Design a binder for this molecule. Sequence first.
Ligand code: CA
Ligand code: CA
Ligand code: CA
Length: 141
Amino acid sequence: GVEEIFASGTWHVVDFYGKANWDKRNGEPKYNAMAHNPDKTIATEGRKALDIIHGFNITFKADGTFTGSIQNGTIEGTWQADGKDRTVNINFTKTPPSTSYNNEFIEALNNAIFYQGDSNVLLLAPEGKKTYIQFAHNKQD
Ligand SMILES: [Ca+2]
Ligand SMILES: [Ca+2]
Ligand SMILES: [Ca+2]
């Protein structure tokens, strides 16, 4: 069931993905692309963004609660998923002092309604399926 994917250990952010083809679990990784922009100043901003978002992680518990860590502190809340249609509903009860990257992460999780994944990855997409956030069970480095 859903606990076998969600409650499978700490999930660490890989990237935010755009131009998604949800059917095929593919898309364009935003900050890894930014770090390879041909404008060296934009590439520098992408490298800094990667170091920040790689620190973002979340742990879902089988009791329907979660905690996680982003800039300035912890997130907390509740979650439900349905394995019959691969849908999810995340609800925040605590967020730390805001930052641009925090706001992006919190919005992605708040808008998530579909999921897919496997023993390595978790992808969460909003209703339009044009974007997703991807996690892994290891911190990116
Ligand atoms: Ca359902
Ligand atoms: Ca690496
Ligand atoms: Ca490594």
